[PDB]
UniProtKB/Swiss-Prot annotation, chains A, B:
Record note on quaternary structure: Homodimer; further associates as a homooctamer.
Cofactor(s) named in the record: Mg(2+); Mn(2+)
Domain Integrase catalytic: 1-146
Top-rank taxon, per record: Viruses
Native species: Rous sarcoma virus subgroup C (strain Prague) (RSV-Pr-C)
Cofactor note: Binds 8 Mg(2+) ions per integrase homotetramer. Zn(2+) can also be a cofactor for the nicking activity, but not for the polynucleotidyltransferase activity.
Protein name, UniProt field: Integrase
Domain notes for this protein: The core domain contains the D-x(n)-D-x(35)-E motif, named for the phylogenetically conserved glutamic acid and aspartic acid residues and the invariant 35 amino acid spacing between the second and third acidic residues. Each acidic residue of the D,D(35)E motif is independently essential for the 3'-processing and strand transfer activities of purified integrase protein.
Function: Catalyzes viral DNA integration into the host chromosome, by performing a series of DNA cutting and joining reactions. This recombination event is an essential step in the viral replication cycle. Has a strong preference for using the 3'-OH at the viral DNA end as a nucleophile.
Parent-protein start and end of this portion: 1334 to 1479 of 1603
Length: 146, 146
């Protein structure tokens, strides 16, 4: 009612411990601080849309999504996908310098958690491909659920 | 406090429109009625554990999970995975006849929704492999978010 606006922040961050699908797409729901992360082999417009399809299934449809000016986010294809869903998109002030410190902070907490969990299982370098999915799901659980 | 107990019901259901990964793993959180669905190529113990890793990331860790006596759920491997997480597992009364009508109902609502969404996009038979992920995420959004 007087509750926070439903605005998300989304960004891509590279994590070589998760190669070959080392591009992690991370969305922070600013109203709840919930985080959703998915893994991708390449940063393309389609990877961003696949990420947000997953995020909408888990968090519901937001009123707006804030991103940086990465081309996977400002292409015609991504713009039409967001219009199809009725979601407003902003890159904020053109040289906002900040504006998405929340997702930036999530990126760092996420990578730290993947490293500590991986090293706890004995993987000091790249995580074996077959173990990556449960390890990413474990890091996401750890940052969301208390 | 006096709130519902955190108990999930999980089951596998076959959906050929989603081949080759036509086995859908579905978990209903009975306290909230939220549903989580994932797709798999084969029904094995590991598919069930991958499903619940995803469900825990999205819903939190439950106190118990109720399933039928399917072998992917009662194997030594699945039993040890659930013990590693500290989750109690029950198959309910041995010949409960029911006991998981909630997940049974979710299975049917899910398959109906996949069919209506698929036919809305012009896929009357199997959904093209590259479109399945967003279509499953759309069906999950539709059954959870209002
Ligand atoms: Mg970026
Ligand atoms: Mg069954």
């Amino acid at each position: 009612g007087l509750g926070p606006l439903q605005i998300w922040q989304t960004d891509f961050t590279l994590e070589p411990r998760m190669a070959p699908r080392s591009w992690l797409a991370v969305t922070v729901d600013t109203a709840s601080s919930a985080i959703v992360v998915t893994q991708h082999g390449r940063v393309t417009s389609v990877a961003a849309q696949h990420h947000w399809a997953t995020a909408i299934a888990v968090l519901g449809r937001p009123k707006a999504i804030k991103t940086d000016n990465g081309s996977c986010f400002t292409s015609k294809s991504t713009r039409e996908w967001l219009a199809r869903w009725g979601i407003a998109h902003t890159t904020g002030i053109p040289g906002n310098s900040q504006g998405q410190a929340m997702v930036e902070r999530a990126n760092r907490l996420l990578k730290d958690k993947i490293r500590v969990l991986a090293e706890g299982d004995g993987f000091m370098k790249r995580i074996p491909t077959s173990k990556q999915g449960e390890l990413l799901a474990k890091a996401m659980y750890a940052l969301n659920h208390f």
